Design a protein around this motif. Sequence first.
Motif, short mmCIF file in Angstrom:
data_model
loop_
_atom_site.label_atom_id
_atom_site.label_comp_id
_atom_site.label_asym_id
_atom_site.label_seq_id
_atom_site.Cartn_x
_atom_site.Cartn_y
_atom_site.Cartn_z
N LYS C 70 41.38 32.37 48.19
CA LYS C 70 41.57 31.16 48.58
C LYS C 70 40.23 31.09 49.72
N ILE C 71 39.60 30.05 49.83
CA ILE C 71 38.57 29.91 50.65
C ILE C 71 38.72 28.60 51.46
N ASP C 72 39.07 28.73 52.71
CA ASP C 72 39.66 27.53 53.69
C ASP C 72 40.71 26.82 53.13
N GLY C 73 41.90 27.73 52.43
CA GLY C 73 43.04 27.38 52.23
C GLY C 73 43.07 26.65 50.70
N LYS C 74 41.93 26.75 49.94
CA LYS C 74 41.68 26.11 48.45
C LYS C 74 41.33 27.19 47.47
N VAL C 75 42.04 27.14 46.45
CA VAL C 75 41.49 28.26 45.43
C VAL C 75 40.33 27.97 45.04
N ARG C 76 39.56 28.89 44.74
CA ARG C 76 37.96 28.84 44.25
C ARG C 76 37.83 29.93 43.35
N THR C 77 37.60 29.56 41.91
CA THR C 77 37.72 30.35 40.86
C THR C 77 35.87 30.67 40.60
N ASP C 78 35.26 30.01 41.15
CA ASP C 78 33.66 30.28 41.02
C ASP C 78 33.40 31.55 41.59
N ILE C 79 32.54 32.56 40.95
CA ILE C 79 32.27 33.65 41.67
C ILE C 79 30.79 33.83 42.44
N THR C 80 30.24 32.63 42.26
CA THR C 80 28.79 32.59 42.94
C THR C 80 29.17 31.29 44.24
N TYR C 81 30.48 31.15 44.60
CA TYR C 81 30.54 29.87 45.39
C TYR C 81 29.89 30.54 46.75
N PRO C 82 29.30 29.57 47.78
CA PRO C 82 28.50 29.88 48.71
C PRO C 82 29.60 29.71 49.81
N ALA C 83 29.88 30.97 50.45
CA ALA C 83 30.91 31.22 51.66
C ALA C 83 29.90 31.54 52.84
N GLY C 84 30.09 30.60 53.81
CA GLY C 84 29.21 30.86 54.89
C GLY C 84 30.07 31.15 56.49
N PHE C 85 29.18 30.87 57.47
CA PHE C 85 29.80 31.30 59.03
C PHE C 85 30.93 30.35 59.17
N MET C 86 31.93 31.26 59.84
CA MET C 86 33.16 30.79 60.32
C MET C 86 34.09 30.27 59.08
N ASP C 87 33.88 30.93 57.90
CA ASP C 87 34.90 30.51 56.87
C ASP C 87 35.93 31.35 56.83
N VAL C 88 37.26 31.01 56.33
CA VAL C 88 38.24 31.96 56.35
C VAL C 88 38.78 32.12 54.74
N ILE C 89 38.74 33.52 54.52
CA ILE C 89 38.86 33.97 53.04
C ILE C 89 40.45 34.56 53.12
N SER C 90 41.33 34.16 52.06
CA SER C 90 42.65 34.79 52.03
C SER C 90 43.05 35.05 50.52
N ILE C 91 43.89 36.47 50.70
CA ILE C 91 44.26 37.02 49.62
C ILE C 91 45.65 37.40 49.87
N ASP C 92 46.22 36.44 49.09
CA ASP C 92 47.86 36.41 49.34
C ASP C 92 48.44 37.43 48.45
N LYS C 93 47.67 37.98 47.52
CA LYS C 93 48.38 39.34 46.55
C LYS C 93 48.40 40.29 47.42
N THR C 94 47.22 40.75 48.23
CA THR C 94 47.35 41.70 49.36
C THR C 94 47.89 41.40 50.63
N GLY C 95 47.73 40.25 50.72
CA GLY C 95 48.34 39.62 52.29
C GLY C 95 47.02 39.82 53.23
N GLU C 96 45.95 39.79 53.09
CA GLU C 96 44.75 39.97 53.91
C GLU C 96 44.01 38.60 54.05
N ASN C 97 43.49 38.43 55.27
CA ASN C 97 42.69 37.30 55.79
C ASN C 97 41.64 37.76 56.45
#
Lengths: 205, 50, 262, 151
Positions: C70-97
């Motif tokens: 999840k990027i900024d709380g929204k699920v992204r399936t694109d693998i080339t999605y541009p993630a930038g400064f001050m963005d939040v990446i969440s992985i609930d499967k491993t519980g990582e932020n």
Amino acid sequence: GISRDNWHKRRKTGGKRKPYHKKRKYELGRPAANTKIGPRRIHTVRVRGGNKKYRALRLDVGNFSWGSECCTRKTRIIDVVYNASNNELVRTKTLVKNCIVLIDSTPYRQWYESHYALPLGRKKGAKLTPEEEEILNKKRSKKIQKKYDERKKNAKISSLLEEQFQQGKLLACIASRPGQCGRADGYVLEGKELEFYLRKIKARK
Amino acid sequence: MKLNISFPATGCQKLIEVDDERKLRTFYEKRMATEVAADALGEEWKGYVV
Amino acid sequence: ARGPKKHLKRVAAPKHWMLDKLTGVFAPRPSTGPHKLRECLPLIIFLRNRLKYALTGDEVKKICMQRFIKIDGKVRTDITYPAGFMDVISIDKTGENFRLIYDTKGRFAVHRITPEEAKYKLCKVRKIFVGTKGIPHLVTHDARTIRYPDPLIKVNDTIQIDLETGKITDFIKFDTGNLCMVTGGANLGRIGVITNRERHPGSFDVVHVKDANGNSFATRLSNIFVIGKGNKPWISLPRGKGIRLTIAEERDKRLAAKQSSG
Amino acid sequence: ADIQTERAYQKQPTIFQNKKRVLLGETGKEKLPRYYKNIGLGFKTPKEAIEGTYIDKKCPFTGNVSIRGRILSGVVTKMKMQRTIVIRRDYLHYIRKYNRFEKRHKNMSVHLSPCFRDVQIGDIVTVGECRPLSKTVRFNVLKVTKAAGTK
RNA sequence: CGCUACUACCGAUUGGAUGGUUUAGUGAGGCCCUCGGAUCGGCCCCGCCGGGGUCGGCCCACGGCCCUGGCGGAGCGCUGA
RNA sequence: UGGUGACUCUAGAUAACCUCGGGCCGAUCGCACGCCCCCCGUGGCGGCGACGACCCAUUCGAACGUCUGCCCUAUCAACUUUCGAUGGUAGUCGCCGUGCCUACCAUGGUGACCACGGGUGACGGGGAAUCAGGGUUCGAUUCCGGAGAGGGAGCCUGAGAAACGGCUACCACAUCCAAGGAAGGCAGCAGGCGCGCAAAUU
RNA sequence: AAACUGCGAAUGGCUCAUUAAAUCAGUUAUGGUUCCUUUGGUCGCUCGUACUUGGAUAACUGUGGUAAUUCU
Ligand SMILES: [Mg+2]
Ligand SMILES: [Mg+2]
Ligand SMILES: [Mg+2]
Ligand SMILES: [Mg+2]
Ligand SMILES: [Mg+2]
Ligand SMILES: [Mg+2]
Ligand SMILES: [Mg+2]
Ligand SMILES: [Mg+2]
Ligand SMILES: [Mg+2]
Ligand SMILES: [Mg+2]
Ligand SMILES: [Mg+2]
Ligand SMILES: [Mg+2]
Ligand SMILES: [Mg+2]
Ligand SMILES: [Mg+2]
Ligand SMILES: [Mg+2]
Ligand SMILES: [Mg+2]
Ligand SMILES: [Mg+2]
Ligand SMILES: [Mg+2]
Ligand SMILES: [Mg+2]
Ligand SMILES: [Mg+2]
Ligand SMILES: [Mg+2]
Ligand SMILES: [Mg+2]
Ligand SMILES: [Mg+2]
Ligand SMILES: [Mg+2]
Ligand SMILES: [Mg+2]
Ligand SMILES: [Mg+2]
Ligand SMILES: [Mg+2]
Ligand SMILES: [Mg+2]
Ligand SMILES: [Mg+2]
Ligand SMILES: [Mg+2]
Ligand SMILES: [Mg+2]
Ligand SMILES: [Mg+2]
Ligand SMILES: [Mg+2]
Ligand SMILES: [Mg+2]
């Protein structure tokens, strides 16, 4: 086809330049829309970006504005009298931007008589029709007559516009580009500009 | 000259090979979509319109 | 060319991705999105090169198509999605932020954050304009448009956005004495306090910043991002507090660490 | 009269000069309100632009142009075109091999507004960049300073 | 000056040659405008087959007013492509 | 109202217009299915998504502009302006700014600080070889820009092409044919002929 | 399966013929334009058969023409 590029032109020094690429799509040009006076005929053109241009080929009506009275009305177009760019455009009766045309005066006369409740464009013979009589001589109350009489203080029009209203046709200038937007809009000539164009028209004759 | 004849009500087609100028005279100098009387084809086509 | 380009040569990719030369001829061209091509980090690079979760590009797709990222709380399936400064990446499967923050070397760092902190982000106000019916609109650095912002918020300010509702909670004004990070240029990744601003009409403005250790530097106004009010940041900082060391003292620290190792 | 010299009527597009008024206010003065603007960057509007009556759509102060880009300087060399002059910019080009310089010059055709008068050949002019006004003109005269021999 | 050979120069004259320009006279093809109208429909006028209501003389028959599904023929009637 | 160094900016108000070759204002698809009523119905309500769409903002760009910068040549010293060369006014066309084009006007514009013309076994740079310090020579070639698809020219579709593993002609070649017709473009990968001192597997 | 619809085919790959303020490099501008797609914002803001309206076309089934085509 018709190309409006800059590399077919001579240099500032006067020497000619050899082109380095062939004609491109984004440098194209299209034949002119010579808009005449007649029953409406407009063709759409698909332009760059997928947008539309309305190519007016024939027009007979348009909305013009009386600026001093701020009265915008839709009126038919009668004739073309003057053209600053070229006099061949007048002979062929072509509608372009900034050309001087003659338009009908009836809607403006109707608004003037319904607003100030005064005669306008009428002959001195004083012939009348009952509809016009009840438009001008309607029975109004004290409060409404008080507003109309106050409006009658500002009811005054220059002699040039009055004579044009007597003739039944007004002189107007087109401010829109018919070949690009498909409509012929403009404003009624008045003031120093009207005198200038009257002098130009008279000198042309 | 072959004729590919279709009957739409039954939806049946049949190809018939005609070797005769008289049978084809009535079709000459005719444009498409025109209605003709197919009597010259023979005795079977009495009253048929094509 | 006759139209948009769709490829990216590996040697022509941004140098803060730290790609090697001999792996291939191409690099993942970022998709169009909130951040620029030269100032983003594609999801595949973060997912296989930084975190070592995947070994190939196929495994990145296999992870993404399970809707784990999840990027900024929204699920992204694109693998080339541009993630930038001050963005939040969440992985609930491993519980990582994680939060994408530049390190002092000008590269995006793997910065883990508390799940409580992962609920908000900071944004820089890029544009203020009035739209139809006289409604104010505010446009941030990550292409977010917010209606009816606080009347005191102007350009070059910082707002705190709650990722769940996407609404402003509070803001920091651009004034001398506040804490800022450099987001571009030679001083990219540095943190300091604003000292003064030089105004050049018709041209770029220059801002002077001084860090905690007392080192001073300058940048353009477009490369400054206000992080906190005064000396207190409103976000968590990476291992380096934004202080850039010289090569001599980096060598000294490395030698000291080696001597104490073992 | 003197302004109206073309086949078309010369007017300032943003000024409405046909506003009707009472007969008492007509007798006073037929003084059109002038349209002018501040161009920014610390340049002042010449008084001849505010009080003048000329019509020029390419004037930086009373026309429809925008000054953005580079601000340059030159010396007036020719004034023979209508509302546009030719200035010369002189400089030195460095040749690395010989560690020396050579003298070079460039010519610029720039637009001169009627607000600037008493401009002679050999005085300094400060010009600003704008959109292409013609085939060879991309700059507009912003300031005029006289030569050293001014008395 | 008399022998023996080579390269470069002129210059009777016109050939095998191509390449590049242009004066005039034609000029394929696309595109734009003004016409054009093979043909294909829809709407009106009749006729007979069929289903819903109602009205009339009324008793399981037949007309009126509307709709409704098809079929056949006219009108250089109207209109759209 | 808000903003810029600077609007003829953004927003607001008023009078009208609004193209039949016609702007928007959803007759579209999937999965889980439940709460409510004087009710059993025309039953009412409701959660996630997919697709589409007018208009703003953003991303990827593209396209026009500003300043400076390029190898030899005077046995090339004046060039440009009839057929736009330099500028002004009004228009047309164009996605926009402009002699881009048109009409009417002024006589302008460039040049020993080398204009104009000619040559280049000239695509331009990032770079390469040699080098005490200066410098000389190279850069077709894997990265970034440009151009082209045998030579010219004209177009359809599309957001984007004057596209050629798209179309239509002419010019030069050239394939099958039952002579009536039909079909072409390796400077993409291999490979073949020719060319040459000179370069790989169908 | 086939066919209708949608998207892509304007990227990539090749070569260096043309081209000498042209291309190109650094530096600026678009307050002088267009922009598929992604991301965000709007999408009862209009006071004027709907419990879902209409006619066709492929794939398919049958009849064919030409020496010959991804012809019809
Ligand atoms: Mg070329
Ligand atoms: Mg390519
Ligand atoms: Mg991609
Ligand atoms: Mg030296
Ligand atoms: Mg022709
Ligand atoms: Mg406004
Ligand atoms: Mg103009
Ligand atoms: Mg002009
Ligand atoms: Mg070459
Ligand atoms: Mg070279
Ligand atoms: Mg050396
Ligand atoms: Mg040496
Ligand atoms: Mg190179
Ligand atoms: Mg090269
Ligand atoms: Mg070569
Ligand atoms: Mg290349
Ligand atoms: Mg090409
Ligand atoms: Mg080729
Ligand atoms: Mg070849
Ligand atoms: Mg060809
Ligand atoms: Mg498309
Ligand atoms: Mg082509
Ligand atoms: Mg090929
Ligand atoms: Mg290709
Ligand atoms: Mg090959
Ligand atoms: Mg082959
Ligand atoms: Mg070899
Ligand atoms: Mg060989
Ligand atoms: Mg398909
Ligand atoms: Mg496409
Ligand atoms: Mg290859
Ligand atoms: Mg450049
Ligand atoms: Mg523009
Ligand atoms: Mg977009």
